[PDB]
Enzyme design. Structure first.
Site, PDB file in Angstrom:
ATOM      1  N   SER A  14       0.794  -1.228   0.155  1.00 43.75           N
ATOM      2  CA  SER A  14      -0.092   0.045   0.019  1.00 43.75           C
ATOM      3  C   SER A  14       0.598   1.302  -0.067  1.00 43.75           C
ATOM      4  O   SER A  14       2.057   1.161   0.238  1.00 43.75           O
ATOM      5  CB  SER A  14      -0.835   0.013   1.283  1.00 43.75           C
ATOM      6  OG  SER A  14      -0.248   0.435   2.198  1.00 43.75           O
ATOM      7  N   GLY A  16       0.840   5.854  -1.710  1.00 43.43           N
ATOM      8  CA  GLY A  16       0.062   6.701  -2.279  1.00 43.43           C
ATOM      9  C   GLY A  16      -1.017   5.910  -3.461  1.00 43.43           C
ATOM     10  O   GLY A  16      -1.957   6.756  -3.612  1.00 43.43           O
ATOM     11  N   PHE A  17      -0.683   5.040  -3.958  1.00 42.41           N
ATOM     12  CA  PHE A  17      -1.567   4.149  -5.018  1.00 42.41           C
ATOM     13  C   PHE A  17      -2.765   3.903  -4.357  1.00 42.41           C
ATOM     14  O   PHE A  17      -3.789   3.637  -5.057  1.00 42.41           O
ATOM     15  CB  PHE A  17      -0.942   3.394  -5.736  1.00 42.41           C
ATOM     16  CG  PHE A  17      -0.055   2.310  -4.908  1.00 42.41           C
ATOM     17  CD1 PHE A  17      -1.011   1.221  -4.542  1.00 42.41           C
ATOM     18  CD2 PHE A  17       1.244   2.604  -4.700  1.00 42.41           C
ATOM     19  CE1 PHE A  17      -0.186   0.278  -3.776  1.00 42.41           C
ATOM     20  CE2 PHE A  17       1.775   1.616  -3.778  1.00 42.41           C
ATOM     21  CZ  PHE A  17       1.072   0.251  -3.432  1.00 42.41           C
ATOM     22  N   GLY A  18      -2.759   3.587  -2.954  1.00 44.22           N
ATOM     23  CA  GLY A  18      -3.836   2.737  -2.524  1.00 44.22           C
ATOM     24  C   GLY A  18      -3.602   1.609  -1.827  1.00 44.22           C
ATOM     25  O   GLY A  18      -2.283   1.393  -1.213  1.00 44.22           O
ATOM     26  N   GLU A  89      -4.658  -8.369 -14.032  1.00 46.69           N
ATOM     27  CA  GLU A  89      -3.967  -9.462 -14.215  1.00 46.69           C
ATOM     28  C   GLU A  89      -2.679  -9.538 -13.203  1.00 46.69           C
ATOM     29  O   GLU A  89      -2.022  -8.600 -13.075  1.00 46.69           O
ATOM     30  CB  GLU A  89      -3.394  -9.326 -15.845  1.00 46.69           C
ATOM     31  CG  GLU A  89      -1.844  -9.863 -15.689  1.00 46.69           C
ATOM     32  CD  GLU A  89      -1.100  -9.648 -17.034  1.00 46.69           C
ATOM     33  OE1 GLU A  89      -1.347  -8.322 -17.435  1.00 46.69           O
ATOM     34  OE2 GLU A  89      -0.322 -10.426 -17.550  1.00 46.69           O
ATOM     35  N   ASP A  96       8.984  -7.217  -8.206  1.00 47.44           N
ATOM     36  CA  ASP A  96       8.982  -6.053  -8.764  1.00 47.44           C
ATOM     37  C   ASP A  96      10.607  -5.596  -8.944  1.00 47.44           C
ATOM     38  O   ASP A  96      11.410  -6.128  -8.172  1.00 47.44           O
ATOM     39  CB  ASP A  96       8.286  -4.933  -7.965  1.00 47.44           C
ATOM     40  CG  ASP A  96       8.901  -4.469  -6.642  1.00 47.44           C
ATOM     41  OD1 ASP A  96       8.500  -3.565  -6.087  1.00 47.44           O
ATOM     42  OD2 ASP A  96      10.125  -5.074  -6.500  1.00 47.44           O
ATOM     43  N   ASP A 135       5.257   7.734 -14.234  1.00 49.22           N
ATOM     44  CA  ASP A 135       5.677   7.254 -12.948  1.00 49.22           C
ATOM     45  C   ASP A 135       6.608   5.896 -13.251  1.00 49.22           C
ATOM     46  O   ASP A 135       6.415   5.107 -12.244  1.00 49.22           O
ATOM     47  CB  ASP A 135       4.614   7.139 -11.974  1.00 49.22           C
ATOM     48  CG  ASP A 135       5.392   6.880 -10.486  1.00 49.22           C
ATOM     49  OD1 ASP A 135       6.205   7.705 -10.308  1.00 49.22           O
ATOM     50  OD2 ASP A 135       4.524   6.411  -9.693  1.00 49.22           O
TER      51      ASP A 135
HETATM   52  N1  LIG Z   1       6.210  -1.815  -5.676  1.00 53.35           N
HETATM   53  C1  LIG Z   1       5.325  -2.731  -5.255  1.00 53.35           C
HETATM   54  C2  LIG Z   1       4.255  -2.465  -4.152  1.00 53.35           C
HETATM   55  C3  LIG Z   1       3.126  -3.406  -3.891  1.00 53.35           C
HETATM   56  C4  LIG Z   1       2.524  -3.612  -5.219  1.00 53.35           C
HETATM   57  C5  LIG Z   1       3.460  -4.421  -6.169  1.00 53.35           C
HETATM   58  N2  LIG Z   1       3.771  -5.547  -5.928  1.00 53.35           N
HETATM   59  C6  LIG Z   1       3.058  -6.790  -6.504  1.00 53.35           C
HETATM   60  C7  LIG Z   1       3.368  -8.069  -6.217  1.00 53.35           C
HETATM   61  C8  LIG Z   1       2.826  -9.004  -7.065  1.00 53.35           C
HETATM   62  C9  LIG Z   1       2.015  -8.592  -7.866  1.00 53.35           C
HETATM   63  C10 LIG Z   1       1.756  -7.239  -8.087  1.00 53.35           C
HETATM   64  C11 LIG Z   1       0.764  -7.023  -8.958  1.00 53.35           C
HETATM   65  N3  LIG Z   1       0.155  -7.772 -10.058  1.00 53.35           N
HETATM   66  N4  LIG Z   1      -0.763  -7.120 -10.842  1.00 53.35           N
HETATM   67  C12 LIG Z   1      -0.773  -5.804 -10.459  1.00 53.35           C
HETATM   68  C13 LIG Z   1      -1.315  -4.732 -10.855  1.00 53.35           C
HETATM   69  N5  LIG Z   1      -1.295  -3.572 -10.354  1.00 53.35           N
HETATM   70  C14 LIG Z   1      -0.489  -3.397  -9.281  1.00 53.35           C
HETATM   71  C15 LIG Z   1      -0.557  -2.134  -8.600  1.00 53.35           C
HETATM   72  C16 LIG Z   1       0.699  -1.597  -8.007  1.00 53.35           C
HETATM   73  C17 LIG Z   1       0.807  -0.470  -7.473  1.00 53.35           C
HETATM   74  C18 LIG Z   1      -0.174   0.606  -7.761  1.00 53.35           C
HETATM   75  N6  LIG Z   1      -1.094   0.237  -8.640  1.00 53.35           N
HETATM   76  C19 LIG Z   1      -1.184  -1.027  -9.047  1.00 53.35           C
HETATM   77  C20 LIG Z   1       0.228  -4.321  -8.887  1.00 53.35           C
HETATM   78  C21 LIG Z   1       0.183  -5.752  -9.424  1.00 53.35           C
HETATM   79  N7  LIG Z   1       2.107  -6.433  -7.518  1.00 53.35           N
HETATM   80  C22 LIG Z   1       4.542  -3.227  -6.465  1.00 53.35           C
END
Ligand SMILES: N[C@H]1CCC[C@H](Nc2cccc(-c3n[nH]c4cnc(-c5cccnc5)cc34)n2)C1
Length: 273
Positions: A14, A16-18, A89, A96, A135
């Protein structure tokens, strides 16, 4: 009812993005990511092709979602009283780029070449669909650890691509160009290229080049790791202080350092397996 269509898993993170959760679509067990964003926290709003109030993020995602999977696709979305929920998805297994770099240190140039190339392809796809991410950074790109494929995430700071100046910005400041810092003005593509320069340096050095505004404005790059002269040149080109001095995306991909990139699969076999 999304509560019954999806089995909610652990919180992935979690900020700023939520808030983003791991999930699984009950119908076919497809791995998914479940993103919650509070309405109060959304300032950028857009219109759906059928005329409805939705976060711009949803608009942008819809425009980039399809065949080319350099970008994590939006599968569905729901509106709640005080928030929006996005179903996205989710590759597996995944890490990451920030964590990958952190644990592995600076990346071998062969690996960075492949990763950077894939990011460039993903960003080009966005721009071709009329979307500006705004971003680009290691935290916002996922690595499919089995296939060696990278995926772009979080369009919550994005915008429709335009040829006129942007005077708003809510991306990551240390990835933002000197023209933003100095004038609060920037153009989409040239600003994107700057952030890509930051990203590339990050890949091959293990850390970001600038921390303070004065450093961004000075725009002087120093290398803490052994980096080829070709790579150094590309980085310095992307980080040109004058936006018009920066390379186009075609110029980046035609740069000598960018030649003979490995395919995603080859990259995984050599560097990830
Ligand atoms: N820096 C980190 C912060 C936590 C979110 C993210 N980590 C992971 C880990 C496994 C899958 C996904 C994942 N799988 N599919 C996704 C779609 N959108 C988002 C995402 C992340 C941040 C903001 N908005 C969307 C994340 C995902 N994201 C990245």
């Amino acid at each position: 009812p999304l509560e019954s269509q999806y089995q909610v898993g652990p919180l992935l993170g979690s900020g700023g993005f939520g808030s983003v959760y791991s999930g699984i679509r009950v119908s076919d067990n497809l791995p998914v990511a479940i993103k919650h964003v509070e309405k109060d926290r959304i300032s950028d709003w857009g219109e759906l092709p059928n005329g409805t109030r939705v976060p711009m993020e949803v608009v942008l995602l819809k425009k980039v979602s399809s065949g080319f999977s350099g970008v994590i696709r939006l599968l569905d979305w729901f509106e709640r009283p005080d928030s929006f929920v996005l179903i996205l998805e989710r590759p597996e297994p995944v890490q990451d780029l920030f964590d990958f770099i952190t644990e592995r240190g600076a990346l071998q140039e062969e690996l960075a070449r492949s990763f950077f190339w894939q990011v460039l392809e993903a960003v080009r796809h966005c721009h071709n669909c009329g979307v500006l991410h705004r971003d680009i950074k290691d935290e916002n790109i996922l690595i499919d650890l089995n296939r060696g494929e990278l995926k772009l995430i979080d369009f919550g700071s994005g915008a429709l691509l335009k040829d006129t100046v942007y005077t708003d910005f809510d991306g990551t400041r240390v990835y933002s160009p000197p023209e933003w810092i100095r004038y609060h003005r920037y153009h989409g593509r040239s600003a994107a290229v700057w952030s890509l320069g930051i990203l590339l340096y990050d890949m091959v050095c293990g850390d970001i080049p600038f921390e303070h505004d004065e450093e961004i404005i000075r725009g002087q790059v120093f290398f803490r790791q052994r980096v080829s002269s070709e790579c150094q040149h590309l980085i310095r080109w992307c980080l040109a202080l004058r936006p018009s001095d920066r390379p186009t995306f075609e110029e980046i991909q035609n740069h000598p350092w960018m030649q003979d990139v490995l395919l995603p699969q080859e990259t995984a076999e050599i560097h990830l397996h």
